[PDB]
Every structure is written in C-alpha cells, then in structure tokens.
Amino acid sequence: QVIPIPSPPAKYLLPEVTVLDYGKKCVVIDLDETLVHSSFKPISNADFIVPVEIDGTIHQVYVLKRPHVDEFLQRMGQLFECVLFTASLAKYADPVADLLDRWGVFRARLFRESCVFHRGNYVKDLSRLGRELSKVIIVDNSPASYIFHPENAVPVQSWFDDMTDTELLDLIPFFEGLSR
Structure with missing residues (x-):
C-alpha cells in the first residue's frame, strides 16, 4: 500500500471487447509469410526497411x-475485430506493423510474449484470447x-x-460471405 504495487497480470491475451467491436468475429492474423516476407539479405525492391537492434547491434530488415x-x-x-498475432520478436514485428x-x-x-513453446513449436493458443471460440x-x-x-x-x-499470388484478394469474398 505505501508505494503502488506493480500492475497485476491480465488473465486473457486481449482486453474485453470494446463498443465498436460488439457483434464482430475476431480474426487472428499472422505476419511472417502470411502478410509479408522479411530478410536480412539486401534487396533493391523492398517495401520497407526496418532497423532492428539485437544484442547492441543493428540489423537492417528488408520487408x-x-x-x-x-x-x-x-x-x-471494416468487418472484424482484427488481431495481429505473431511468434516474432516485437522489436521487429511492431515497427513492421506501424508501416503496414x-x-x-x-x-x-500480440508477439512472442503471447505464444507458448510446445514440442518444438510456438503455439498461438486461441482459447487464451478471451473470445468465443466459434x-x-x-x-x-x-x-x-x-x-x-x-x-x-x-x-x-x-x-x-x-x-x-492472389490469396489475400481471394480471402476478401470468403470473409465477406462469413460476415454474411
């Protein structure tokens, strides 16, 4: 009580759904190899360049x-409550999401901190989101x-x-139809 106790941890990945989002399905979207592809190998036609500091040293990431x-x-x-959910380092993924x-x-x-290591892989446990799974x-x-x-x-x-590639364009009518 004397000095403020540090903030007690949330039990869910997301806060409670806000007003503008009532009645909307929650769509969890990945970043790497889903929305973009990044390398550290320089290319002349990158869409973004993002500098990422790791262990005190700067890596240029080409997106x-x-x-x-x-x-x-x-x-x-327009249609959903959209959530970016990646097993990537936030220092990388966050500035990328700012540009994208x-x-x-x-x-x-949600980045690496929200993923759980399970048998070699980083899992996005959707039951932890705080949303109706259906x-x-x-x-x-x-x-x-x-x-x-x-x-x-x-x-x-x-x-x-x-x-x-046209998969993201083909995803549009699919998601419209299930918006109904």
Whole structure:
C-alpha cells in the first residue's frame, strides 16, 4: 500500500471487447509469410526497411508486402475485430506493423510474449484470447501455430516473393460471405 504495487497480470491475451467491436468475429492474423516476407539479405525492391537492434547491434530488415495486403487489411478492418498475432520478436514485428497498418485496422498486436513453446513449436493458443471460440478465425501460413485449433483456420500458403499470388484478394469474398 505505501508505494503502488506493480500492475497485476491480465488473465486473457486481449482486453474485453470494446463498443465498436460488439457483434464482430475476431480474426487472428499472422505476419511472417502470411502478410509479408522479411530478410536480412539486401534487396533493391523492398517495401520497407526496418532497423532492428539485437544484442547492441543493428540489423537492417528488408520487408516485401504480399500482393493485395492493403486491400485485404482495409476490408478486414471494416468487418472484424482484427488481431495481429505473431511468434516474432516485437522489436521487429511492431515497427513492421506501424508501416503496414496505416489505418488503425489492428485492434491489438500480440508477439512472442503471447505464444507458448510446445514440442518444438510456438503455439498461438486461441482459447487464451478471451473470445468465443466459434467466433474466432485464424489467418496463418504455419499450421503448427494453430495446432490446438485447426478447425478455426482457413488454409493460407506461405508467401516469400511471388507477385502473382492472389490469396489475400481471394480471402476478401470468403470473409465477406462469413460476415454474411
């Protein structure tokens, strides 16, 4: 009581759903190989460059945007409570999301701290979100991420650099139809 006790830990990944989000499915979206592909190998046509300090030293990260990601994120931001959920380091993923999400589309961003190590893999345990599970969808290229919840996952192919990819555009009418 004398001096303030540090903040007591939340029991759920997300806060309670806000007003503008009542009645909306929660869509958990992955970052790496889902929305973008990053390397440390320099390329001339990167979409973003992000400097990341690890162990006191600066790495330049080169980020390519999967085709149609802007249009996809824009429409998802209109229809759902969107949550970025990655097993990537927040020091990397956060500044990337700042450049990618220019429109307040993501209600929340969850990184490595929100993933659990299970038998070689980093799992996104959807029962921890604080949301109705029949009202959660996961958009993620790595089935190992959703090992506990494969019924909530629409299959998403890993994306590296193929500019003919249209999976995010094809996701739009799928998600519109289940917005109903």
